[PDB]
Every structure is written in C-alpha cells, then in structure tokens.
C-alpha cells in the first residue's frame, strides 16, 4: 500500500521497505568477492559487459579513495560513485585537517553514516549499492562492507552479488591466516570463473585490486598478467 513508498515509514512490524527494496538492487547485481591476507586485502569483481565494443577499463567498479584505501562498489554503479566521491572527501579531510591518514575502521564508519542519512528523510532514497572498503592503515589490513541500510561490519572475507551464497562457501575453504596476497589473486579470480555462468551473458571479465606490503602499502590495480586466464 502506502507503507512502502518512502523511507520515513516504519512498517507494522518495524521494517523499512525502501531500504530492503534497495537491498534487492545489490542482490541482482554482479558478483563481488574479497579476502584479508594477513599483510593486505585483495578485492575482485566481475564486470558484465553488455556489448563487444566496450573499451578495456570501462565501468571499473574499483576506485581508489586514499593512497592506502579504496572502495569497490557492488550494486548500482552511478549510486556508488556518490559514495566514492563522499569517502574521498572524508579522507581528504583527515589529511588536510588532522595531518594523518584515515584509519580503516574510521573511513568505513563515515561511509555507513552517509548511507544511513539518506534512509531517514522523506525526500531521499537509499543507495542501491554495497560498498566494500579495503584499507591498509596504521591499524593493519581492514576489510569492511557497508550495506544500503548503513550497517558496517569488519569481515575476513565477503561475497556480494547474485551468487553470493555459492561464492561464500568457496571462501570457507581458504585460510585467511596463512593466506598471502601472492596466491589469493589466483584463488579469488578462480572463484568468479566457477561461481558465474556464461549461459546468461557472453561478455564477462574480472577486475582485481589489492593493497599490501609488496605494493608499498598503496592501493593499486593489478598488472594485467597476474590474473588467471579463465
């Protein structure tokens, strides 16, 4: 009825549907995965190209927020670019005012309050996006996920997207304590080529990015020849 038309309406049992309807925009989106590898964090996503003529590098869902942190989004691409352009502004404030790099748990708590502030007012709609904050600050390697409700949580590994239930069981076979960033790019990319089917889309490729001690604590994308072929 009229109990699911905006954000400032609790249900008869205390639920907000426009937040929960925004969570179905992430569950119908492409598959995301991540891993914390005891000296860094590796994040991989699958770009579903809708045409053969797209340039390699188009629609990259991984964006660098600071030198040590970067947010990969899962859900709607243009809604997540408002989250990226906000968390960059949160990370520029700590460098310019407090003369310090932003911590991993503090950048994620600023993302979860920007995403929550658009779920409490009638004129605004929640994001169709789950943001994955991968950071390496002076509190070690961090891996956070902010859902459209504004809930942040530290993870060791995460699967998000359509086949987030099959890819979650594929993460339970990894270690995360002896796991390094050297092997996990080959492992996490091999999750995506097994969890995802080619009988719906013909064009699908993977985009991996890390931040670890080997890359001098810098959030970078891959050199193109480290990813497995298929």
């Amino acid at each position: 009825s009229g109990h699911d038309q905006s954000t400032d309406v609790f249900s008869a049992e205390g639920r907000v549907f426009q937040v929960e309807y925004a969570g179905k925009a992430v569950d119908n989106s492409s598959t995301a995965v991540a891993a914390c590898c005891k000296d860094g964090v590796v994040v991989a996503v699958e770009k579903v190209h809708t045409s053969r003529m797209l340039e390699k590098g188009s629609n990259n869902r991984i964006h660098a927020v600071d030198r040590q942190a970067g947010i990969c989004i899962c859900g709607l691409l243009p809604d997540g670019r408002a989250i990226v352009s906000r968390a960059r502004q949160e990370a520029e404030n700590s460098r310019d005012i407090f003369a310090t790099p932003i911590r991993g748990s503090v950048l994620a708590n600023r993302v979860g309050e920007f995403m929550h502030a658009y779920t409490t007012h009638f004129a605004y709609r929640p994001f169709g996006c789950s943001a994955i904050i991968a950071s390496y600050a002076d509190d070690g390697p961090q891996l956070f996920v902010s859902d459209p409700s504004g809930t942040v949580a530290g993870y060791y590994g995460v699967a998000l997207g359509k086949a987030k239930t099959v890819a979650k069981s594929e993460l339970e076979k990894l270690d995360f304590s002896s796991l390094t960033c050297d092997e996990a790019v080959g492992k996490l990319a091999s999750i995506l080529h097994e969890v995802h089917d080619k009988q719906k889309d013909k064009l699908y490729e993977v985009e991996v990015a890390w931040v670890c001690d080997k890359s001098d604590r810098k959030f970078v994308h891959v050199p193109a020849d480290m990813v497995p072929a298929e």
Binding site: R67, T100, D138, R217
Partner: protein
C-alpha cells in the same frame, strides 16, 4: 655590530666584528670598529657609522692636544668624559653606542661603557651593539673573571663568534686588540677560521623533517629528497 671589551689583570681586550650594513645589504664586510684615540686607549664603535666616526676623531684631537700640553700620559677616565660630554649634548641627533677601554699606569686596565642615552658606567666587561643581547646569557654562564691575556683573547673571539652566528646585523671578520703595558697587539681572524659557526655545528646537520613523503602512515621518516623515492 657586536662590540665588547673585557678586563684582565694587565690590561683590556677589545673585540668587534667587521660589517657595516645599510639595513639589509652589506656595504662593507671589512669594517674596523676599533678606533685609536691615543696609543693605549681605544674605543669600540656601534650605531651610526658617520655619527660615531665624527665623535671619535673629535675626541682624539682634544685628547692629543691635551697630551702635548700636559707632557705626560692620558688617563682612560679622561677620554671617557669627552665621549660622555659629546654623546649627551647631541643625544637627540646622533645614534652612538661607545665602549671606551684602555690602559693607564695609574689605574691599570679600565672599561667604560657609554650607551646611546649618554651615561657613563665603569665596568669589568662591557657589551654593545645590536648583537650584544645574545651575549648576556653567554657571559652569565661561560665567563669567569680573572683570566690571563691569552685566555681573554680566545674567549672574546669565541664570544663574538656566537654573537654574529645568530645576529643578522653582525658578521665578517673578528678584530681584536689588547691594550696593556706592552705594545698593543692586534689580531684579525677570518670567518673561515672562526671558533664557532652554525654550519659546522654538528647538531644542525640533520634537516628538520618538513617535506614529508606522501605515505600511508603517520610515521615520520624524514624529508623527501628525490622525485622517485
């Protein structure tokens, strides 16, 4: 300008830098601020380079005309009352800080400090010039009275060198002379053989870490000296 005069048992040790500077530019880097009045009485010379030069050669002509008419030696207290008379009746028109120090057989070594106000004070050691404000806490800690002639020379050369290291007005050479019962011995040590300089002071070797590299942590790791690393 940093001028000073220190008394020992025999006589006095005059010490001064060598730089006249028009505000911010070094007009002369080999000035001589130790002015001869008589053979054993000199004066240090700070402030206006013209107003103190005209006083120093007006006193030195009254003082040599006095010595001929007397037929004996001039006391230092005589020469210090000719600067006080002139620096007081011209005190609104000149800028003159004078330190008069010398030797006479009656009183030994005498030091008179005549400031810009025109007063006269007889001292054991005197300080003067714009660089003298660095040397009060240096003489409160490092100066012990009753040194020899060879120790007062190496002290006053070490005293001026700490003064023109911090002062911008002062610098150049270090001109010293001793006035006692022997012949007046002068000595001019250069800048590159000065007893102190901050450029070779081993605690100012490490640069202050201002230009931090763009990094992931708050750990300060020194300046950035190259574009790559």
């Amino acid at each position: 300008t940093t001028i000073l005069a220190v008394s020992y048992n025999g006589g006095v040790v005059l010490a001064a830098d060598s730089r006249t500077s028009s505000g911010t530019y070094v007009v002369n880097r080999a000035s001589n601020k130790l002015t001869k009045l008589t053979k054993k009485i000199y004066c240090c010379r700070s402030g206006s380079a013209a107003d103190t030069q005209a006083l120093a050669e007006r006193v030195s002509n009254y003082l040599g005309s006095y010595q001929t008419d007397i037929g004996a030696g001039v006391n230092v207290a005589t020469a210090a009352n000719l600067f006080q008379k002139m620096c007081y009746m011209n005190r609104w028109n000149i800028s003159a800080g004078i330190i008069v120090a010398g030797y006479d057989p009656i009183n030994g070594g005498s030091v008179y400090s005549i400031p810009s106000g025109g007063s006269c004070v007889k001292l054991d050691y005197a300080l003067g010039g714009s660089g003298s404000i660095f040397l009060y806490s240096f003489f409160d800690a490092n100066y012990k009275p009753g040194m020899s002639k060879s120790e007062c020379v190496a002290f006053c050369q070490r005293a001026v060198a700490h003064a023109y290291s911090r002062d911008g007005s002062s610098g150049g050479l270090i001109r010293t002379i001793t006035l006692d019962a022997d012949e007046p011995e002068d000595q001019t040590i250069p800048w590159n053989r000065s007893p102190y300089c901050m450029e070779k002071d081993p605690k100012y070797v490490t640069q202050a870490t201002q230009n931090q590299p763009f990094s992931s942590s708050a750990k300060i790791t020194g300046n950035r000296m190259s574009s790559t690393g």
